[PDB]
Amino acid sequence: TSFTRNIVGRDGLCVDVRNGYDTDGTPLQLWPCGTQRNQRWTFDSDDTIRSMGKCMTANGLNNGSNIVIFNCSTAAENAIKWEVPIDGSIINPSSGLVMTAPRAASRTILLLEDNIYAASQGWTVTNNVKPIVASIVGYKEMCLQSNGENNGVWMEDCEATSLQQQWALYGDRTIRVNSTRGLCVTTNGYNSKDLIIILKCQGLPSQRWFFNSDGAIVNPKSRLVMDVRASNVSLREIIIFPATGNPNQQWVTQVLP
């Protein structure tokens, strides 16, 4: 009824108890992922998340409050309970605030903030601390492909040798250009028919994605899903659009060798 994993977030960095200290109040931070105990988090049936025998704890329940390690028996019960929504948030149910990495850098301190469905608020609970590398196969069994920073993504015939068809599925719920991992699949707005492009990863809601159980790739802020515009691969436009279940909105990941 408990199991232990790493927690991967912004830029593929892991949730880490700072300096490996277990003193009550020690802040959580981002740090490159490893096997050290201060990165091993045990998920207990009581909705606590523990490292080094102590609990992930909200040091306050306000926008901007720090998250720390703290003795599980002496902390406030409201401060040590966490849920893991399917879209990859880590939420404190009492406050409704979510774990956020406000900067990408090593040593960034983790805060509880208002949920804006930002990529800075995306996490993955896993023992694999490397991004998953896959092709994204969609409409007509074609492959999603990048075409440079600031340019659109679009469909092409799947090629084992096309590097721009290779995507790094990061723990922060970003979809990155595998060869250029500073770049993220980004919606150019939150409205229906806004185009999906590649932009520098900046932790934004426009860069957060969720692979749901219907084969859709969902942008949580907008609610909208990746769509091959007009079921017309020749337009070379992928947009966000409301979920319809139609073939031009169906996607599956295919792991690469």
Ligand X SMILES: OC[C@H]1O[C@H](O)[C@H](O)[C@@H](O)[C@H]1O
Ligand Y SMILES: *[C@@H]1O[C@H](CO)[C@@H](O[C@@H]2O[C@H](CO)[C@@H](O)[C@H](O)[C@H]2NC(C)=O)[C@H](O)[C@H]1NC(C)=O
Ligand Z SMILES: *[C@@H]1O[C@H](CO)[C@@H](O[C@@H]2O[C@H](CO)[C@@H](O)[C@H](O)[C@H]2NC(C)=O)[C@H](O[C@@H]2O[C@@H](C)[C@@H](O)[C@@H](O)[C@@H]2O)[C@H]1NC(C)=O
Q: By the criterion CB under 6 A, which residues form the site for ligand NAG?
A: 232, 234-235
Q: Which two tokens stand for residue 195?
A: 């185009």
In the chain, the amino acid numbered 5 is R
CA 160/CA 143 separation, integer angstroms: 10
Q: By the criterion CB under 6 A, which residues form the site for ligand Y?
A: 130, 133, 166, 178-179, 256
Distances (CA, A) of 50 to 22, 37, 94, 102, 221: 11, 10, 18, 22, 29
Q: Which string of x and - marks every residue 34-53 that binds ligand X (by CB under 6 A)?
A: --x-x---------------
**35 touches, from ligand NAG, ligand Z, ligand Y, none (C-beta below 5 to 8 Å by class):** none
Among 114, 141, 157, 214, contact with ligand Z (rule: CB under 6 A) = 114
Verify binding: residue 60, ligand X, rule CB under 6 A. Answer: no
Q: Which is nearer to ligand Y, 122 or 131 (CB)?
A: 131
The beta strand positions in 138-251, using DSSP E, are: 143-145, 154-156, 167-169, 175-177, 180-187, 196-200, 210-211, 217-218, 225-228, 238-241
Q: How far is the CB of 249 from ligand X (least distance, A)?
A: 6
With contact defined as beta carbons under 8 Å apart, do 170 and 14 qualify?
no
**113 touches, from ligand NAG, ligand Z, ligand X, none (C-beta below 5 to 8 Å by class):** ligand Z
Among 25, 32, 34, 53, contact with ligand Z (rule: CB under 6 A) = 53
